[PDB]
Design a binder for this molecule. Structure first.
Ligand SMILES: *[C@@H]1O[C@H](CO)[C@@H](O[C@@H]2O[C@H](CO)[C@@H](O[C@@H]3O[C@H](CO)[C@@H](O)[C@H](O)[C@@H]3O)[C@H](O)[C@H]2NC(C)=O)[C@H](O)[C@H]1NC(C)=O
Lengths: 48, 50
């Protein structure tokens, strides 16, 4: 990961997460998920 | 009405009779017999694709 002295570690994907996402992408998703939810597609099991 | 009646944990006050929800739908009811709080939920439905 040596590119002329430039550092792309904050935009390239990392294999240390179940979702292969960059740090900035994770920040963006966390910021937007204030109203986005992580639901399971709201199946017919919604009978609690 | 039609639905699936199941046990409910709604904390009904003694004067309260009919339950409700966000948009004018009765999701709970009180028995006109020996008191018991009961839920109302419609049975399953969906769409079909070929
Ligand atoms: C390219 O940039 C990234 C970040 O923009 C550099 O990674 C960062 O490296 C520093 C020092 O190596 C890390 O600081 C240390 O973090 C540990 C975490 O436990 C902490 O204990 C230390 O006290 C210190 O604060 C920093 O965390 C790390 N950033 C990330 C996101 O991992 C990277 O080193 C740069 N590339 C090169 C070749 O220098």
């Amino acid at each position: 990961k040596y590119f002329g002295g430039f550092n792309f570690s904050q935009i390239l994907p990392d294999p240390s997460k179940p979702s292969k996402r960059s740090f900035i992408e994770d920040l963006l998703f966390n910021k937007v998920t204030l109203a986005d939810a992580g639901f399971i597609k709201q199946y017919g099991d919604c009978l609690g | 009405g039609t639905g699936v009646l199941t046990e409910s944990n709604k904390k009904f006050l003694p004067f309260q009779q009919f339950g409700r929800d966000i948009a004018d739908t009765t999701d709970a009811v009180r028995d006109p017999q020996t008191l018991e709080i009961l839920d109302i939920t419609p049975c399953s439905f969906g769409g079909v694709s070929v």
